Design a protein around this ligand. Structure first.
Ligand SMILES: N#C[C][C][S]([C]C(=O)[N]C(=O)O[C][C][C][C][C][C][N][C]1[C](C#N)N([O])C2=C([C]=[C][C]=[C]2)N1[O])B1234B567B89%10B%11%12%13B85%14B%1158B%12%11%15B%139%12B%1061B%12%112B5%153B%14874
Ligand SMILES: N#C[C][C][S]([C]C(=O)[N]C(=O)O[C][C][C][C][C][C][N][C]1[C](C#N)N([O])C2=C([C]=[C][C]=[C]2)N1[O])B1234B567B89%10B%11%12%13B85%14B%1158B%12%11%15B%139%12B%1061B%12%112B5%153B%14874
Ligand code: NA
Ligand code: NA
Length: 129
């Protein structure tokens, strides 16, 4: 599924991501924009053989099981395929664990490089939320 901006903002809110770990909703929408272009089916292979999955490009190195990342963990206790669904529940639950791991949203390199310290509220501007 390719979400619209406000559509995704709304979905994130309903699943309790807004202000989660102190990160306002615009931060999450901005991260999703640059991670996946709002496409729940987005996959990208990493140099090291891990893969990033879904709207927030969650990595198989730590967070999900894809059967082809040796030595990896599955801290969200989910198949990585779950992170590609139209329904974002699994992605949001896993992202809550990630953002709680010590690094905050710096766990998403695209957030640090393209959202941190910008007008992130712009991503939710205009939206009925
Ligand atoms: S946040 C601020 C933030 O995240 N700053 C921080 O990341 O600064 C370190 C990096 C430097 C950013 C400098 C440029 N900031 C601009 C800007 C420009 N250029 N703008 O054009 C703005 C702006 C804030 C609001 C309107 C326009 N803003 O903070 B902010 B905004 B609203 B009221 B406004 B102010 B307070 B509350 B929220 B809190 B503060 B701003
Ligand atoms: N951090 C910080 C300083 C904010 S100062 C600006 C400030 O305090 N403005 C604030 O009190 O405005 C009240 C209205 C807030 C509306 C917030 C929604 N819009 C935002 C925003 C947010 N939230 N942002 O974070 C922005 C932004 C526009 C551009 C960059 C960041 N923007 O339009 B400002 B002054 B110096 B150079 B001058 B300009 B930039 B830098 B500092 B920054 B901006 B002024
Ligand atoms: Na909070
Ligand atoms: Na894994």
């Amino acid at each position: 599924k390719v979400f619209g901006r406000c559509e995704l903002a709304a979905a994130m809110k309903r699943h309790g991501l807004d202000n989660y770990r102190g990160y306002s909703l615009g931060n999450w929408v901005c991260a999703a924009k640059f991670e996946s272009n709002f496409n729940t089916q987005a996959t990208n292979r990493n140099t090291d053989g891990s893969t990033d999955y879904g709207i927030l490009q969650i990595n198989s190195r730590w967070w999900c099981n894809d059967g082809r990342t040796p030595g990896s963990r599955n801290l969200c206790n989910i198949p990585c395929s779950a992170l590609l669904s139209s329904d974002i529940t699994a992605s949001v639950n896993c992202a809550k664990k990630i953002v709680s791991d010590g690094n905050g949203m710096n766990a998403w390199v695209a957030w640090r490089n393209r959202c941190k310290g910008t007008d992130v509220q712009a991503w939710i501007r205009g939206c009925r939320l």
